[PDB]
Design a protein around this ligand. Structure first.
Ligand SMILES: Cc1cc2nc3c(=O)[nH]c(=O)nc-3n(C[C@H](O)[C@H](O)[C@H](O)COP(=O)(O)O)c2cc1C
Ligand SMILES: Cc1cc2nc3c(=O)[nH]c(=O)nc-3n(C[C@H](O)[C@H](O)[C@H](O)COP(=O)(O)O)c2cc1C
Lengths: 108, 105
């Protein structure tokens, strides 16, 4: 099952909702992530160029897909097939961002 | 500001998240709507053909926009400029639906 993250549109995109699969994939409970920017999923082996592409796309409210190395709450790495899109009203205003996370690590 | 509703993909698309503007527009608190299908916003003068187009779009996970008559908690009618889209993973599985509601009364 794929995770879903919903964030606020503005001011560093704090998480406002995660689905159950997000907790299965990442090991974080909703309590532990609400109000935070999702960058806490990254760590030392995360590719900086990938993070830069995400940062520029989100600032521009442009959809983006990347494979990015992320980390579970207890530090276990996983590859995240990540897709982020703005949610817009019909006037084009960004209401939120939605991200889908698929664990594409062969853990076992 | 526009409302946002997030639902599960299956089992009659129960609401799992609403933003602040949803409550400003509709007069419902989150605890009054979570776990329910959004159709409770409809009422006596809602256009049945519009509802049927939404039903078919959600069944097929097709993006759709409609101007639909809805009702606030206090029973006052309002025009909802509603846009719904599926949220998909890379393999095309539907993870959720997202709806944006603009009060265009
Ligand atoms: C809706 C949404 C979901 C996100 N999900 C993830 C994720 O699962 N993993 C991740 O590494 N970054 C994720 N991000 C990206 C980070 O929040 C952040 O935008 C990125 O690290 C680039 O900005 P920075 O260089 O300021 O950290 C997400 C962002 C948004 C808006
Ligand atoms: C994410 C989402 C948001 C929705 N928001 C609204 C809404 O604001 N107003 C409304 O009348 N129907 C809304 N609906 C539509 C109803 O939930 C339902 O799909 C529609 O009435 C057609 O199905 P039915 O014939 O089974 O009721 C929404 C549906 C989804 C999936």
């Amino acid at each position: 099952a794929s995770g879903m993250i919903v964030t606020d549109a503005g001011a560093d995109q704090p998480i406002v909702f995660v689905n159950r699969a997000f907790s299965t994939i990442t090991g974080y409970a909703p309590n532990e992530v609400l109000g935070r920017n999702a960058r806490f999923l990254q760590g030392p082996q995360t590719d900086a160029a990938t993070v830069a592409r995400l940062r520029e796309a989100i600032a521009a409210a442009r959809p983006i897909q990347e494979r990015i190395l992320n980390y579970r709450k207890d530090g276990q790495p996983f590859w995240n097939q990540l897709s982020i899109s703005p949610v817009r009203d019909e006037t084009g205003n960004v209401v939120a961002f939605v991200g889908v996370e698929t664990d594409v690590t062969a853990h076992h």
